[PDB]
PDB file of C-alpha atoms (C1' of nucleotides) in Angstrom:
ATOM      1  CA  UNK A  27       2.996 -10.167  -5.782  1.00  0.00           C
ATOM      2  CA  UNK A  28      -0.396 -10.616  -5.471  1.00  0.00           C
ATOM      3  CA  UNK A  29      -1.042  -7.833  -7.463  1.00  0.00           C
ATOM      4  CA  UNK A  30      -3.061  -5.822  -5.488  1.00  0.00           C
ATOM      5  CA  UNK A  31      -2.524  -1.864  -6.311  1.00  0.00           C
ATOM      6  CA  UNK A  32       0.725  -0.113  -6.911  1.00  0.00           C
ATOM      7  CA  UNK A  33       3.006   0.392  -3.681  1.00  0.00           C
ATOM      8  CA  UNK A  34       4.068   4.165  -2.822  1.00  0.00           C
ATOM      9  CA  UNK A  35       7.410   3.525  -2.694  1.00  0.00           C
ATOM     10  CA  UNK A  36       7.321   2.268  -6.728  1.00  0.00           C
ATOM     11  CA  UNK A  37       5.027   5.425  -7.154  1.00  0.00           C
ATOM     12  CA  UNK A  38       7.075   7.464  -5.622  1.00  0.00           C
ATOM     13  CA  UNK A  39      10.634   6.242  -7.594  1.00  0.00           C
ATOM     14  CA  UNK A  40       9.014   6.455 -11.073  1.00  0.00           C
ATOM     15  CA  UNK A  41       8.270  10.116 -10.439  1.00  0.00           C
ATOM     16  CA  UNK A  42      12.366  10.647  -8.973  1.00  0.00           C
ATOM     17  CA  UNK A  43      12.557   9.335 -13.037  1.00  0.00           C
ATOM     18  CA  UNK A  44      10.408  11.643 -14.699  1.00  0.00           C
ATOM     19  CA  UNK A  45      11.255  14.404 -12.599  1.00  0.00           C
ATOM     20  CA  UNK A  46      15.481  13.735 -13.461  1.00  0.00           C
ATOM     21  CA  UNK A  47      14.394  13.407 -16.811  1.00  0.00           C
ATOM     22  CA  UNK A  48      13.610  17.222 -16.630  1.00  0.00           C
ATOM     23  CA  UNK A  49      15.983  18.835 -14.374  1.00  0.00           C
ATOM     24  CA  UNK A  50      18.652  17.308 -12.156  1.00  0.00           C
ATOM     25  CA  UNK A  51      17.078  17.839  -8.534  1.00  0.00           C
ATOM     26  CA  UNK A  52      17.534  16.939  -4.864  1.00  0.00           C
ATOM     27  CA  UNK A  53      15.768  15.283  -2.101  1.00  0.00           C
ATOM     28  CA  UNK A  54      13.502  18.060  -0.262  1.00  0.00           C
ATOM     29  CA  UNK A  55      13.160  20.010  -3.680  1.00  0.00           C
ATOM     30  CA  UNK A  56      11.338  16.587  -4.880  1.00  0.00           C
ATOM     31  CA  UNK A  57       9.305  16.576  -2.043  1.00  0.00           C
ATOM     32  CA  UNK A  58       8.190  20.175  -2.511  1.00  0.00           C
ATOM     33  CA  UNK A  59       6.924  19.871  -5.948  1.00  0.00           C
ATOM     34  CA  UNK A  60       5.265  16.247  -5.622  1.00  0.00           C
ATOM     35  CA  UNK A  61       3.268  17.656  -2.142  1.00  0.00           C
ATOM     36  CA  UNK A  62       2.411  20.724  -4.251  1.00  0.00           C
ATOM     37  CA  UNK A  63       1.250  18.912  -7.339  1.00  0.00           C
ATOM     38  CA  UNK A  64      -0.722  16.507  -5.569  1.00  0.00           C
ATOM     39  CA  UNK A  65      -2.383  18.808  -2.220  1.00  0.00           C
ATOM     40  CA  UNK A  66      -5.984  18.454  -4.357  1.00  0.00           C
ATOM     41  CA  UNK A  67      -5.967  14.477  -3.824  1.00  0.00           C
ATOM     42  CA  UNK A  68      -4.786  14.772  -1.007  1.00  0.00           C
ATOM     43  CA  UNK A  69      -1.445  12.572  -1.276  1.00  0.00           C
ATOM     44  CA  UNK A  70       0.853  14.170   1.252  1.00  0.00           C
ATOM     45  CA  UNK A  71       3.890  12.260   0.981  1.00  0.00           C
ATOM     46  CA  UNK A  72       6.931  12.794   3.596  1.00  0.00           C
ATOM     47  CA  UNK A  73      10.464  13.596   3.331  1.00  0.00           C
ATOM     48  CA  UNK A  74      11.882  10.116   3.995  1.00  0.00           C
ATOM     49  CA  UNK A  75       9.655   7.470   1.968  1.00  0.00           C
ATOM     50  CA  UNK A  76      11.226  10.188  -0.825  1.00  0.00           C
ATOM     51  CA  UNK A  77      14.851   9.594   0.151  1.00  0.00           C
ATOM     52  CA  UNK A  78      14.311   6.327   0.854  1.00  0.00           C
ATOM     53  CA  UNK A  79      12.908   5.940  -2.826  1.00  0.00           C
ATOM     54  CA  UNK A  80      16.042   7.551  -4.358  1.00  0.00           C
ATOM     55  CA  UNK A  81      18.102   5.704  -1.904  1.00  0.00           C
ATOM     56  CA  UNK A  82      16.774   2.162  -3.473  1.00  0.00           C
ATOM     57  CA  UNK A  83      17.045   3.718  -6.873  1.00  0.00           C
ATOM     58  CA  UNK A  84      20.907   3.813  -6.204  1.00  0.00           C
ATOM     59  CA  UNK A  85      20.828   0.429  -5.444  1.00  0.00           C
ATOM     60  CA  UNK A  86      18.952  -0.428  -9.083  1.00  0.00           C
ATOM     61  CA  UNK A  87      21.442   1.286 -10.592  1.00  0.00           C
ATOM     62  CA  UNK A  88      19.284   3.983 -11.852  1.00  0.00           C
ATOM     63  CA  UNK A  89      20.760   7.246  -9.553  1.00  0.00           C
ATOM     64  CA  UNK A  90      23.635   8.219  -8.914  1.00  0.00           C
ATOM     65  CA  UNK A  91      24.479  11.260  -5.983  1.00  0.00           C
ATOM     66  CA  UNK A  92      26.298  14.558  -7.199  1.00  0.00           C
ATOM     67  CA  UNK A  93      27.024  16.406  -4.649  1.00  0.00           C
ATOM     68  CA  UNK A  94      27.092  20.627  -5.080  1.00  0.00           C
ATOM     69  CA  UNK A  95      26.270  23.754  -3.362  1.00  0.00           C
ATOM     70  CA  UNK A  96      23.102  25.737  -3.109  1.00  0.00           C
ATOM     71  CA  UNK A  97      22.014  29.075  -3.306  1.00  0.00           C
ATOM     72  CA  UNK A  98      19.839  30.212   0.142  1.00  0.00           C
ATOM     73  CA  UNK A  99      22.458  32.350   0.848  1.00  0.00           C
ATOM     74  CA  UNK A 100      23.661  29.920   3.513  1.00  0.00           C
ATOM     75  CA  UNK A 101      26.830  28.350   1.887  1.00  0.00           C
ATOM     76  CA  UNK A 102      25.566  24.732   2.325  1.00  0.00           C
ATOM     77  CA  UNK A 103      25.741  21.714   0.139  1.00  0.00           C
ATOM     78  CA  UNK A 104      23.145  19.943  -1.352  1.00  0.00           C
ATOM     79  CA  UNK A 105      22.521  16.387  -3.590  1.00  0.00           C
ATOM     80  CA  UNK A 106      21.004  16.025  -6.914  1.00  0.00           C
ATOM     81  CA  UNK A 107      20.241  12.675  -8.945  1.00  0.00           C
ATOM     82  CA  UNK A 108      21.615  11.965 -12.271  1.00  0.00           C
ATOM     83  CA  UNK A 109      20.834   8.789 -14.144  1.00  0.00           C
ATOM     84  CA  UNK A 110      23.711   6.316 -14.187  1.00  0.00           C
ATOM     85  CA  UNK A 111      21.986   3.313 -16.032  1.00  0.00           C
ATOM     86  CA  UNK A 112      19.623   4.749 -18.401  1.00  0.00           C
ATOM     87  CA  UNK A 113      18.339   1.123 -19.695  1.00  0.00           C
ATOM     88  CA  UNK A 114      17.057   0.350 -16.315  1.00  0.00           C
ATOM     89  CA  UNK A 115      15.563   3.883 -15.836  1.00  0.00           C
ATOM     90  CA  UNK A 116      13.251   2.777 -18.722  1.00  0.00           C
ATOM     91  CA  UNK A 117      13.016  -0.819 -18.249  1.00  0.00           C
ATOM     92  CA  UNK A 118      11.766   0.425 -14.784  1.00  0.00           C
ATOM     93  CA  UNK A 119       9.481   3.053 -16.128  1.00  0.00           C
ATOM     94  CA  UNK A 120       8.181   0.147 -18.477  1.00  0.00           C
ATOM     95  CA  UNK A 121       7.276  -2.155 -15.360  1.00  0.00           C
ATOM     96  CA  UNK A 122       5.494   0.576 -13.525  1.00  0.00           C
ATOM     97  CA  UNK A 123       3.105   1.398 -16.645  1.00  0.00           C
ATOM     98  CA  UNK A 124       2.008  -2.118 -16.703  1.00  0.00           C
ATOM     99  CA  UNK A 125       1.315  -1.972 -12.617  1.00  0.00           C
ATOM    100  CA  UNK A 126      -0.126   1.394 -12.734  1.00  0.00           C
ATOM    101  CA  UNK A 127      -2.780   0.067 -16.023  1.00  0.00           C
ATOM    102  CA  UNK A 128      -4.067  -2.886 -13.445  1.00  0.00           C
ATOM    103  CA  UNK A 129      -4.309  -0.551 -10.955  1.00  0.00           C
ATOM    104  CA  UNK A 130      -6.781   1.464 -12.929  1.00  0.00           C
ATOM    105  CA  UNK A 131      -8.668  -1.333 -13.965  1.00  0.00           C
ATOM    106  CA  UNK A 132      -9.271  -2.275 -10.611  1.00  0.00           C
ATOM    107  CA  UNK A 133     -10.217   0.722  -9.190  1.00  0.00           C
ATOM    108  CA  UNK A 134     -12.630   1.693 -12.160  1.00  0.00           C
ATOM    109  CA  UNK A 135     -14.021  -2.072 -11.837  1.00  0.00           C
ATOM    110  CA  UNK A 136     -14.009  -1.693  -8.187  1.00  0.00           C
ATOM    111  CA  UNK A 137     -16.217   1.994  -8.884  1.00  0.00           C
ATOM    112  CA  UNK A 138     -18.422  -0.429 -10.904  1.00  0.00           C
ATOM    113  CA  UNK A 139     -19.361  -3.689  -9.278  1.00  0.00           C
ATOM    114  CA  UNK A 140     -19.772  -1.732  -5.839  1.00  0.00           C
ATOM    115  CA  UNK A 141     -21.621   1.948  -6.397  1.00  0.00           C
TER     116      UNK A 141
ATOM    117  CA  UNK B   7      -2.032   8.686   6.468  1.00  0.00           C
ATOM    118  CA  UNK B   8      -0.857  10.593   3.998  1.00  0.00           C
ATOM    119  CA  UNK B   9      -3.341   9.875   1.852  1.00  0.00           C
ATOM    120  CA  UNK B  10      -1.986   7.441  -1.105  1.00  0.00           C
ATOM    121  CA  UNK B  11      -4.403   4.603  -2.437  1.00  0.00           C
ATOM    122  CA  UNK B  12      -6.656   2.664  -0.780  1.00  0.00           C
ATOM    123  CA  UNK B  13      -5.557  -0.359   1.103  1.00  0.00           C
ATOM    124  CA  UNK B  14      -6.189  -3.884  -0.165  1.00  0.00           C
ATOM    125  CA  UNK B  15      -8.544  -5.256   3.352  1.00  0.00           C
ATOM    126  CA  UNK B  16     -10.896  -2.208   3.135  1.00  0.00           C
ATOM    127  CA  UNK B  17     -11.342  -3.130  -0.674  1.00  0.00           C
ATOM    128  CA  UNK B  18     -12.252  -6.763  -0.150  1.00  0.00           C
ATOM    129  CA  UNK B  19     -14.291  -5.536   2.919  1.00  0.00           C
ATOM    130  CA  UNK B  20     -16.224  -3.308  -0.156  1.00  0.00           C
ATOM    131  CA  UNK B  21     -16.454  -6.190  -2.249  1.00  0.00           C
ATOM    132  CA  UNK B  22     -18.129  -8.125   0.651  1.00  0.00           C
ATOM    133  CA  UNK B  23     -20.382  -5.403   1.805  1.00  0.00           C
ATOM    134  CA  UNK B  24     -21.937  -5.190  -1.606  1.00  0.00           C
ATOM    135  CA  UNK B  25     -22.378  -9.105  -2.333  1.00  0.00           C
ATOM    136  CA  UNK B  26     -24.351  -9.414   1.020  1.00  0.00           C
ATOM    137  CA  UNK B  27     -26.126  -6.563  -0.448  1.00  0.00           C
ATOM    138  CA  UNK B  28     -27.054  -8.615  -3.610  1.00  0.00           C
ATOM    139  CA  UNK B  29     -27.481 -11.755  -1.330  1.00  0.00           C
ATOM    140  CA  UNK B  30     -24.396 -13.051  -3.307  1.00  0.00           C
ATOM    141  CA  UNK B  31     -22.176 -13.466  -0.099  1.00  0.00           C
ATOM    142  CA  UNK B  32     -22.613 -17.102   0.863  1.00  0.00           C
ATOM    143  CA  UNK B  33     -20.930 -20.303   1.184  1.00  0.00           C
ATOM    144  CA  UNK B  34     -17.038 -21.222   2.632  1.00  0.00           C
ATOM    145  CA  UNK B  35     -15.371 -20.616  -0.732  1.00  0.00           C
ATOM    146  CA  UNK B  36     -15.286 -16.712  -0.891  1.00  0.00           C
ATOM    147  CA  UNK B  37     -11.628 -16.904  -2.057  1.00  0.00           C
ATOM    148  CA  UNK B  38     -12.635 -18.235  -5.437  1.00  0.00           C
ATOM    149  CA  UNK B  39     -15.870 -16.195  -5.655  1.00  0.00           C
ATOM    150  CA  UNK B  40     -13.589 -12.609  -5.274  1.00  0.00           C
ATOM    151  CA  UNK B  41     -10.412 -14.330  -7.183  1.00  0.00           C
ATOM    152  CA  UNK B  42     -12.791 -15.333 -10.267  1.00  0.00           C
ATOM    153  CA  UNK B  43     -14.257 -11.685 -10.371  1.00  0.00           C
ATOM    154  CA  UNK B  44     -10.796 -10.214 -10.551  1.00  0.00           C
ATOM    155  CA  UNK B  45      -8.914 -13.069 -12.770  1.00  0.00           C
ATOM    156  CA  UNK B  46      -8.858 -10.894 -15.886  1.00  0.00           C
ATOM    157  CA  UNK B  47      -7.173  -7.569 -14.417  1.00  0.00           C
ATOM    158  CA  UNK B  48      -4.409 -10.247 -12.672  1.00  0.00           C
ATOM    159  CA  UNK B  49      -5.267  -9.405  -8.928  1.00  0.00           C
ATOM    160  CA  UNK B  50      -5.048 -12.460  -6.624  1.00  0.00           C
ATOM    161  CA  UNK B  51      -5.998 -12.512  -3.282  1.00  0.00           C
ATOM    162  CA  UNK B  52      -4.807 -15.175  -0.747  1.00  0.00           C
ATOM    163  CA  UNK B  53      -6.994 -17.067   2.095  1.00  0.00           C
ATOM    164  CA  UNK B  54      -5.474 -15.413   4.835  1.00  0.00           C
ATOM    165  CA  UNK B  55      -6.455 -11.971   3.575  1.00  0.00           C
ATOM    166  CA  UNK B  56      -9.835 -12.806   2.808  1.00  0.00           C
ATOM    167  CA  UNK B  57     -10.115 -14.689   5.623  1.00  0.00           C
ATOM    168  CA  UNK B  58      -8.900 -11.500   7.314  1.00  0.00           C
ATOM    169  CA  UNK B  59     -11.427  -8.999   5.426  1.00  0.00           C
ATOM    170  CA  UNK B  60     -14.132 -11.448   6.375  1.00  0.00           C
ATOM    171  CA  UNK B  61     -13.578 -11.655   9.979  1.00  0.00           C
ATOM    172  CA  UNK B  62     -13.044  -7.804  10.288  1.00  0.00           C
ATOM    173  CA  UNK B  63     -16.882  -7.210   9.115  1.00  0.00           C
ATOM    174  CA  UNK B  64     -18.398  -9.725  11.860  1.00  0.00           C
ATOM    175  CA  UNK B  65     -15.846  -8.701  14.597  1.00  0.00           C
ATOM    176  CA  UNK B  66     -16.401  -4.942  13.887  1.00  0.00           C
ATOM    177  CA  UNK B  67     -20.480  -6.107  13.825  1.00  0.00           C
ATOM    178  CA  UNK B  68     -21.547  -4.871  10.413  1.00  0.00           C
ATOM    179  CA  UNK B  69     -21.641  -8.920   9.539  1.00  0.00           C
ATOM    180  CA  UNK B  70     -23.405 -12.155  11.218  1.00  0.00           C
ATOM    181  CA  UNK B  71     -22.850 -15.469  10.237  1.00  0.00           C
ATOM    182  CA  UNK B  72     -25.669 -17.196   9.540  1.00  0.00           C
ATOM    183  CA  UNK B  73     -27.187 -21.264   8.600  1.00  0.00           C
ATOM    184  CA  UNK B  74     -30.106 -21.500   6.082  1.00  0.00           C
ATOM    185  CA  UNK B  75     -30.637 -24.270   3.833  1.00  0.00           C
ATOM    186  CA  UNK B  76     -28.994 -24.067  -0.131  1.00  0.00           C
ATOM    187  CA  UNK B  77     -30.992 -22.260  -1.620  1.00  0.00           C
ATOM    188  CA  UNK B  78     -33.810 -24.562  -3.198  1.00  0.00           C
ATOM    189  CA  UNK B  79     -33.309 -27.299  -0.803  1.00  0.00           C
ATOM    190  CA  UNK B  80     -35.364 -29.472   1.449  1.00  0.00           C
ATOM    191  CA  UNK B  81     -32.247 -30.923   3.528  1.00  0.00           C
ATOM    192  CA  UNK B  82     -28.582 -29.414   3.014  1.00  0.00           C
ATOM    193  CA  UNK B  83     -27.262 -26.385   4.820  1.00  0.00           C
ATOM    194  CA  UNK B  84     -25.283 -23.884   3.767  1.00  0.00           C
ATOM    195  CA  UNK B  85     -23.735 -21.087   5.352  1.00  0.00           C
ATOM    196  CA  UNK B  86     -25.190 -17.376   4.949  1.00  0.00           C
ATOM    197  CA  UNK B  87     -24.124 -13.518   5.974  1.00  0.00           C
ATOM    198  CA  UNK B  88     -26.587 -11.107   6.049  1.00  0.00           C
ATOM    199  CA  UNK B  89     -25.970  -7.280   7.964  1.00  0.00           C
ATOM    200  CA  UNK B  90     -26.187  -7.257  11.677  1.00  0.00           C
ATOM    201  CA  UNK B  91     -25.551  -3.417  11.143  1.00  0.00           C
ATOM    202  CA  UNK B  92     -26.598  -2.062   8.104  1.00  0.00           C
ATOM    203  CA  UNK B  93     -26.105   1.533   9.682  1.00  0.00           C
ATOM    204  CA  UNK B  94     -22.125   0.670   9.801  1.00  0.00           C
ATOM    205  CA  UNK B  95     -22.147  -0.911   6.506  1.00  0.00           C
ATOM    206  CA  UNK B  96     -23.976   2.290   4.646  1.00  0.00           C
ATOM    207  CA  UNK B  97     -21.298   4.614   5.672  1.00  0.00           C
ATOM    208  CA  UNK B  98     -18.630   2.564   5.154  1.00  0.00           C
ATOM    209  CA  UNK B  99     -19.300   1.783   2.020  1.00  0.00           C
ATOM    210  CA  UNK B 100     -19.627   5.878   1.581  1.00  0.00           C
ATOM    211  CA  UNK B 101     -16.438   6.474   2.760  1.00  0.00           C
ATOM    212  CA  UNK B 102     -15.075   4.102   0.279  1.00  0.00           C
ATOM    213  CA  UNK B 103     -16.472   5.484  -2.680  1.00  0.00           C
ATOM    214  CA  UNK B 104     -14.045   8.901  -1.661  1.00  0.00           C
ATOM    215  CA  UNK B 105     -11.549   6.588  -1.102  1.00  0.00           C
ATOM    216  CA  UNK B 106     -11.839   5.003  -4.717  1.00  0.00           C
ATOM    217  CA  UNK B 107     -12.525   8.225  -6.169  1.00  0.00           C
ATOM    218  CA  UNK B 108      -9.446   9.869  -4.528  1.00  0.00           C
ATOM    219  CA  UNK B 109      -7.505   6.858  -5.434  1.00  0.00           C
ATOM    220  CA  UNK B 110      -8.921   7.330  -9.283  1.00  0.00           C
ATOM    221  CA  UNK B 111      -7.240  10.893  -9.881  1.00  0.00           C
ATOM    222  CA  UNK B 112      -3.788  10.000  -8.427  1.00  0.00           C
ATOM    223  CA  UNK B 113      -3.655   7.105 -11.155  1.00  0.00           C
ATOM    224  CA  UNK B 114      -5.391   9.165 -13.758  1.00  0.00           C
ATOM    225  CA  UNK B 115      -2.425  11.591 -12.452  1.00  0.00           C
ATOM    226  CA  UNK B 116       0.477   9.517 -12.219  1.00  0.00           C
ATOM    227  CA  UNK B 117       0.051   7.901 -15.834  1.00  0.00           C
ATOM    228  CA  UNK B 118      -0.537  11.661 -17.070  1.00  0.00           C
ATOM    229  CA  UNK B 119       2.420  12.745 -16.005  1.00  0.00           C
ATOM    230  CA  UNK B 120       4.871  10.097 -16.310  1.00  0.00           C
ATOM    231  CA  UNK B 121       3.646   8.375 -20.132  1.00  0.00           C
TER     232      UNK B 121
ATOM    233  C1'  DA C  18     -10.417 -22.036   2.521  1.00  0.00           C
ATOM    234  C1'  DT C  19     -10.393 -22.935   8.532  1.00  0.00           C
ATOM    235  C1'  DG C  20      -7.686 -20.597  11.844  1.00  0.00           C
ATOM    236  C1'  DT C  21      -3.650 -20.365  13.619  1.00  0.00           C
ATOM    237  C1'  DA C  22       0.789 -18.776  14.334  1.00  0.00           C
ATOM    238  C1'  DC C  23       4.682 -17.136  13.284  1.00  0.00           C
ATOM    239  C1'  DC C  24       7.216 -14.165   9.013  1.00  0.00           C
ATOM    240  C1'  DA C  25       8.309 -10.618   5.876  1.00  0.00           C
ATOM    241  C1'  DA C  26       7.239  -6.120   3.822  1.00  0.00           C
ATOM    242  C1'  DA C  27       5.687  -1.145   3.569  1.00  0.00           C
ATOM    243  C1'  DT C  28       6.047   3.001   5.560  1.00  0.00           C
ATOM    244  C1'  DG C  29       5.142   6.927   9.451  1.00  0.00           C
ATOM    245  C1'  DT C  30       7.445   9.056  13.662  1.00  0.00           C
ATOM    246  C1'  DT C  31      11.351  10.846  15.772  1.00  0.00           C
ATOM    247  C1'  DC C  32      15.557  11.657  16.073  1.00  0.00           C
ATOM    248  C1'  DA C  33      20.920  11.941  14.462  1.00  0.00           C
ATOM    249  C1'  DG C  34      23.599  15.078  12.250  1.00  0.00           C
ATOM    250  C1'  DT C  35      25.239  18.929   9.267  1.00  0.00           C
ATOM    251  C1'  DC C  36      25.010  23.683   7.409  1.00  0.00           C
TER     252       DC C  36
ATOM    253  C1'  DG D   8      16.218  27.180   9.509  1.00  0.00           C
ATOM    254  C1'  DA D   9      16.997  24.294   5.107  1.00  0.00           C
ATOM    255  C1'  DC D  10      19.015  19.516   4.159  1.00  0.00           C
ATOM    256  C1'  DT D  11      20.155  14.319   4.161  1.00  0.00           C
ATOM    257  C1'  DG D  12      19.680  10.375   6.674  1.00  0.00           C
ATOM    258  C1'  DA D  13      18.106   5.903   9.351  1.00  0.00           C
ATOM    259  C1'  DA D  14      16.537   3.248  13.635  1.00  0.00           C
ATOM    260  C1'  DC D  15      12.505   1.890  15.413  1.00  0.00           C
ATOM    261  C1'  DA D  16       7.984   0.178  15.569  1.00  0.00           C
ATOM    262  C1'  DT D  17       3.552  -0.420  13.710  1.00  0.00           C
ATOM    263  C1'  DT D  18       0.313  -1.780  11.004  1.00  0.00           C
ATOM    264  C1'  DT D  19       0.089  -5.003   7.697  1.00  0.00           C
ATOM    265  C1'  DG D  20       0.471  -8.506   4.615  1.00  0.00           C
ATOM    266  C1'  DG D  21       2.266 -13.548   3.492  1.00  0.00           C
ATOM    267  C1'  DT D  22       3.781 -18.455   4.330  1.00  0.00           C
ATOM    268  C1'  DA D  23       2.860 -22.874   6.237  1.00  0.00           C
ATOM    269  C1'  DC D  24       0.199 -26.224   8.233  1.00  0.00           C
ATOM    270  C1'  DA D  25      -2.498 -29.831   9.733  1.00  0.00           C
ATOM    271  C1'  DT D  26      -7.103 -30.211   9.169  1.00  0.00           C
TER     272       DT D  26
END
DNA sequence: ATGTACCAAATGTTCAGTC
DNA sequence: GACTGAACATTTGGTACAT
């Protein structure tokens, strides 16, 4: 890199992590309570940079799919995340710490030099 | 947009609105004047970006490129930006300090929650 | 650290497809 | 209507160069 600020698709994985961590959830569900949490900022992420975070997640090694049913009353079937490679789940949580500390730096520093 | 941080050009583009400001913005070499000011934090900018950033403010107008002699001189020439809209340049830079500042809490936010 | 010119990467829009 | 998915294309950044 060239180490410019964190990338939203990193920002977005970490918090599939946490979120796992704490209850075994799917895609749109995700979505929901990230867009909630963060409708003060302003950050209105979309259902697909989401998927496509847990998608690349499955690739690290981190998620793995279980698929079971939900409860809308419409006999679906839905897909939560459930860690497969713990290590890596913190090894990766352990790499974005380190981005997200130069990131404040720089935007604190940036708030400095320039207002 | 949806809002995440802000994006690396309209940071340097900051950075270079402010040094004109403070008459700092001067000379070829503006690649090692904004990599030494962000050395420490471990952000490093490449020519083509700041070449980009540069060329955005003088396109867009806010910039004009300028010949004066170094400073102290009686001969030797050096080159010089000064605002060719200072209008442009105040509200941009206004607009940037919401984009910092939104940028701030989702950082703030994100190591919150996930550390 | 010019200025180009062609590359790769990040991510929003729209749709495929199933309940 | 709630859910998972992925091509496409943009807006962008990066590499490479001779200069």
């Amino acid at each position: 890199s060239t180490g410019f600020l964190v990338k939203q698709r990193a920002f977005l994985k970490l918090y599939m992590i946490t979120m796992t961590e704490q209850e075994r959830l799917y895609g749109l569900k995700l979505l929901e309570v990230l867009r909630s949490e963060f409708k003060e900022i302003g950050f209105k992420p979309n259902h697909t940079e989401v998927y496509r975070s847990l998608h690349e997640l499955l690739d690290d090694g981190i998620l793995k799919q279980i698929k079971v049913k939900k409860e809308g009353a419409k006999l679906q079937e839905v897909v939560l995340y459930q860690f497969k490679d713990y290590e890596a789940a913190k090894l990766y949580k352990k790499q974005l710490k380190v981005e997200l500390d130069r990131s404040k730096k720089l935007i604190e520093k940036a708030l400095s030099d320039n207002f």
